[PDB]
Amino acid sequence: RPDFCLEPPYTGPCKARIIRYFYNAKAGLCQTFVYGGCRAKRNNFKSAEDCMRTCGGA
Structure with a gap:
């Protein structure tokens, strides 16, 4: 798994409230x-499947 999957989720400085998925590597x-x-980082996905495909295992 890519190293970015280990990074914490990043809300960033903009003020919208957009629900996104992130890979929680502890869980x-x-x-x-x-x-x-604005200013999304890589551990930020629009769907659970893209998130799991990119950063998981089981």
């Missing part, structure tokens, strides 16, 4: 977080 699962709308 081994994709979970939701609030993205602010």
Whole structure:
């Protein structure tokens, strides 16, 4: 798994409330977080399947 899967979710400095998935490497699962709308990092996915495909295992 790519190293970016280990990074914490990044809301960023914008003020929107957009629900996105991130890979929680401590839990081994994709979970939701609030993205602010700009300056997304790589551990930020629009769907659970893309998140799991990119960063999981079981």
